[PDB]
Each structure stands twice: as structure tokens, then as C-alpha cells.
Design a binder for this molecule. Structure first.
Ligand SMILES: *Cc1cc2c(cc1C)nc1c(=O)[nH]c(=O)nc-1n2C[C@H](O)[C@H](O)[C@H](O)COP(=O)(O)OP(=O)(O)OC[C@H]1O[C@@H](n2cnc3c(N)ncnc32)[C@H](O)[C@@H]1O
Ligand SMILES: O=C(Nc1ccccc1)Nc1ccnc(Cl)c1
Length: 467
């Protein structure tokens, strides 16, 4: 426990027993409020030494869909709660390295990306290079998955932009790790679904942040042309050449329409070249003529765009509802078959039927380290397909229909041998985890668990190992 506090307060227990998915409700015995890493070590150590080893799970912002951060009858470590004035003054300044050829910053494992951003911009105009679409997620939470957005095609996911970690293992041991120090734990933890320890520190790579963003959306009716254009755009920038700084897309609720979403970053030095750069890049595209929608805004406002949508949804009582999300990594070689079978088949053209946004965009696997625990398709270019569904509140039939639609999509992929992989997996059954990881990766994953959390105390809500 040390400097930390073990809370049984009704409101803390309630928050720790729920998540964004709004379905899973496993209750903890207590909520731990640490002051520092040693306190998390002391709590995990005590769980490891106890007779009936209680579950310990870290909670970031509680954005999990199916109880991943829940610890039934155990202790939930509230990593993202502010630690007071002394903690805020003690946060590390960005540091320059001549060996790395740039700056990095050490952050608490529970820090929200929005707070990491505000801190680094205020200390040199620096910022992380690779984002999530939503900044009110914890660093520890995203690094336990991958952390993806429109920059991942170029910079890789957030797990490719971290130099070092401090990890509290399932034995309560504080271990510093990186590519050159305890690499098995470092690569194990990155994308490791919280299985091998709690990240108490992360050393994030930084770049000089742009000031403004030219934010563009364009429409397509031809899927083959929409995907050919996204794939061409993600192939640009090799050797720092001319490219867009963000590439996403989404299916439009109208035939089916698709929207390409791109940005071009700029500052005072590059403001003179933006318009010509954008025009050249757009002139090479095949979008429907006259369907370009452009907005110009500060970098921070573009990065926080989803939080702006959240405030609007909260005011309408549309945020705190069930979210039966399904996130897939789909091989580019089978993306046309996925569009036919799912956007035009399962969804029948009306999406609409999806119950919320459906993101679609490709990434470059070479930007992902093959040593990490993250599971990607067995192909170089693969797409995120994100079914960001919201069920109607107080409507059980709405959640049932969306959960069935998820199952049909999964059965379609398995039946036609698509080779898709779930991102933020919610498998829970043993043979499905084996198939998710594959033979070589499952063996490696089980070996890391035996070494780092033999009692299966950590992140039991993921439902991989018997606690
Ligand atoms: C709700 C949501 C999620 C989201 C998103 C937008 C919204 C509105 N946009 C995303 C995006 O564009 N790109 C992306 O990669 N992910 C996106 N997400 C999903 C999000 O990454 C996940 O929900 C993720 O879990 C992070 O959320 P959060 O920080 O709230 O963490 P958690 O849900 O409580 O816990 C997740 C798992 O990790 C373990 N955990 C938590 N903290 C730690 C630390 N410090 N160390 C180790 N493990 C940790 C939890 O126990 C749980 O298993
Ligand atoms: O959730 C998102 N991305 C995500 C989520 C889970 C896994 C991978 C990507 N992005 C996002 C974009 C616009 N509106 C909203 Cl509510 C959300």
C-alpha cells in the first residue's frame, strides 16, 4: 500500500465496476489510489504473496468494451486519477538525446494522452508522433493494445513510439525495460493486454508539433477506387517525401458511399507551401468531383475532435449507452471481398444499420515491431475496420441486434477464410485465443505469462488465463 490509499467508497467501486461498453459489471473488493510506482508494486506483491491471490487490474479511463479493466472480487488500480499538486510539479520535462536524434518524455502509466499533449506543447512545442482518435485514453491502456489513428501508416502505432517502460510485474517487481534492457518484458507488455504487468512509466517519442491542420474529406462511390487511393496515400513519405500527415476513411450512411479523410500539417515556415502540396496530392486522387470538404484549424483542435463530439453526445444523453464495438484488422488482399460480404452483404447497403461510425483505413505492417505481443494479419498492408456501434438506451433489442451483426461479420470472415484479426480482442474461450495468436505467438505469450504473472493475478478481465 505504502503512500497509496485502498478505497471502498461506493462511487469509486461503482466507476471501477463499469466501462464504456456498458455491459460488463464485475465488482472489485476495493479501488487502489497510488501515489507512485512503489505503491502499485506493494499492492501487486501483496496479491502475489496472499493465500487466495486476489485479482489486480489497472484502470485507465475505462474505455474497454467487455470488462478488460475489471477485477472481480479483487482490487482495481485507478491509474488515471490525478495524484495531487506534488505529483503535477514532479512530472518529467521532455529531454533531448543526441543518440535518439530527438526528444522524449517520461510519463506516468495512467496519464491521459490529452494531458501528455498539453504538457509537451507547453515545454518546447513538442508532441507525440502517433495518436488515437480519442485523447482521453491512458498511455498504459493504449500501449497494452497498440494505439492507432491516421498517423500509424507512417509512424507506426503508439507501441512503435515508446523507448522504455517501468513495469510492475505479476510478482510486484518493478522492472525497467526497453529494446536493449529486459527486451522480453518490454515487447511482451507492448500490445500484451495487461497480461505481464502494470506500466507505471512510459518514455514517449516526441516531434516538433505543427501549429495548424488542413483537414480534408472527399467522397467515393467506387470502393476499388477508394481503397486504391487510400493504399496509394499510405505508400507515400518513404524518406520524408510529400504525403498527407493523417489518412483515415469511413463508410457513409446514404449504393454505398465512402469518405476519405486526410490532413496536411503545417506551421509558419510551411504555410506558404500547404495549398500547392494539398492540390498536387488531391490532383492525383480519384474522388467524386466537387465532393471535397476542407476545414483549416489548430493542431490541438483537430486532435481533440472526438472529445468535442463526446460533449455534444453527453448533452443529448447519447454517450453513456451500451457500445457493442467490433474492431478488425483485415488483410488488404481480402478488403474488396469484405466490402461485398459485409458493407453490401451483412449490412445490405444501409449503414445506418451499423448503429454508428464505421471507420476503414489501411496501415503498413513494417511500421509495427514483429517482436511485440500485438496481433496483426499475416500480410504487409491491412485495414482497420472499426464498427463503432452505439445501442439505443433502455432498448435491449438494439444491443441484441448489434451483437448478432458482430457475430455474422466474424462468421463471414471465418467462413470465407479472410484471415482477419480482432483488435481489442474479446475472445474469452481458450481455442479461440490459440487461433487468434497462432501456434508460434501463443507459445511465446504463455511462456511470458508463466515468467511474469504465474498466478494470473493481472488483467483477468481479458479472460485469457485462469486466475
Ligand atoms: C472508448 C474509446 C476507445 C478508443 C477510441 C475512442 C473511444 C471513445 N479510439 C481509439 C483509437 O482511435 N485508436 C485506438 O487504438 N484505440 C481507441 N480506443 C480503444 C482504446 O485504446 C482502448 O479502450 C484501451 O483499452 C485504452 O482505454 P483506457 O486507457 O481507458 O484503458 P482501460 O480500458 O481502463 O484498460 C485497458 C486494458 O489495459 C489494462 N491497463 C490499463 N492501464 C494499464 C497500465 N497502466 N498498465 C498495464 N495495463 C493497463 C487494463 O487492465 C485492461 O486490460
Ligand atoms: O473510436 C475510434 N477509433 C477506434 C476505436 C477502437 C479501436 C480502434 C479505433 N474513433 C472515433 C472516431 C470518431 N468518433 C468516435 Cl466516437 C470515435
Amino acid at each position: 500500500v505504502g503512500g497509496g490509499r485502498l478505497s471502498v467508497d461506493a462511487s469509486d467501486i461503482a466507476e471501477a465496476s463499469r466501462d464504456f461498453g456498458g455491459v460488463a459489471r464485475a465488482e472489485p473488493m476495493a479501488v487502489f489510489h497510488p501515489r507512485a510506482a512503489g505503491d502499485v508494486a506493494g499492492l501487486v506483491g501483496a496479491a502475489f504473496r496472499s493465500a487466495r491471490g486476489f485479482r489486480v487490474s489497472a484502470r485507465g479511463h475505462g474505455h474497454s468494451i467487455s470488462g478488460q479493466a475489471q477485477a472481480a472480487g479483487g482490487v482495481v488500480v485507478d491509474m488515471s486519477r490525478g495524484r495531487g499538486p506534488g505529483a503535477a510539479v514532479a512530472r518529467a520535462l521532455p529531454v533531448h538525446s543526441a543518440a535518439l536524434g530527438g526528444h522524449y518524455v517520461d510519463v506516468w502509466g495512467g496519464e491521459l494522452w490529452v494531458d501528455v499533449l498539453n504538457w509537451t506543447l507547453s515545454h518546447g512545442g513538442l508532441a507525440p508522433r502517433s495518436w488515437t482518435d480519442y485523447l482521453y485514453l491512458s498511455v498504459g491502456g493504449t500501449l497494452s493494445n497498440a494505439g492507432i489513428s491516421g498517423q500509424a501508416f507512417h509512424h507506426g502505432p503508439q507501441i512503435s513510439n515508446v523507448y522504455e517502460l517501468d513495469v510492475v510485474t505479476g510478482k510486484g517487481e518493478v522492472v525497467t525495460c526497453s529494446e536493449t534492457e529486459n527486451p522480453d518484458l518490454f515487447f511482451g507488455v507492448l500490445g500484451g493486454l495487461g497480461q505481464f504487468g502494470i506500466i507505471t512509466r512510459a518514455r514517449i517519442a516526441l516531434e516538433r508539433a505543427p501549429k495548424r491542420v488542413r483537414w480534408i474529406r472527399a467522397l467515393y462511390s467506387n470502393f476499388s477506387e477508394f481503397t486504391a487511393d487510400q493504399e496509394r496515400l499510405i505508400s507515400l513519405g518513404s524518406g520524408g517525401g510529400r504525403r498527407f500527415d493523417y489518412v483515415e476513411g469511413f463508410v457513409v450512411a446514404a449504393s454505398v458511399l465512402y469518405c476519405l479523410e486526410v490532413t496536411k500539417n503545417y506551421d509558419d515556415e510551411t504555410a506558404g507551401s500547404v495549398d500547392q502540396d494539398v492540390d498536387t496530392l488531391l490532383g492525383e486522387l480519384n474522388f467524386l468531383p466537387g465532393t471535397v470538404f476542407t476545414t483549416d484549424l489548430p493542431y490541438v483542435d483537430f486532435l481533440d475532435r472526438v472529445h468535442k463530439a463526446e460533449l455534444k453526445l453527453r448533452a443529448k444523453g447519447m454517450w453513456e449507452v451500451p457500445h457493442p464495438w467490433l474492431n478488425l484488422f483485415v488483410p488488404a488482399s481480402r478488403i474488396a471481398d469484405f466490402d461485398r460480404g459485409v458493407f453490401r452483404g451483412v449490412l445490405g447497403g444501409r449503414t445506418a444499420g451499423a448503429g454508428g461510425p464505421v471507420l476503414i483505413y489501411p496501415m503498413n505492417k513494417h511500421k509495427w515491431d514483429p517482436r511485440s505481443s500485438a496481433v496483426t494479419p499475416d500480410e504487409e498492408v491491412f485495414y482497420l475496420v472499426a464498427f463503432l456501434r452505439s445501442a439505443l438506451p433502455g432498448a435491449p433489442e438494439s444491443l441484441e441486434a448489434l451483437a448478432r451483426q458482430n457475430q455474422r461479420i466474424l462468421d463471414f470472415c471465418a467462413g470465407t477464410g479472410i484471415g482477419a484479426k480482432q483488435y481489442l480482442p474479446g475472445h474469452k474461450a481458450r481455442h479461440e485465443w490459440a487461433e487468434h495468436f497462432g501456434a508460434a505467438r501463443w507459445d511465446r505469450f504463455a511462456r511470458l505469462k508463466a515468467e511474469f504473472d504465474p498466478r494470473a493475478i493481472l488483467a483477468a478481465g481479458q479472460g485469457i488465463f485462469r486466475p
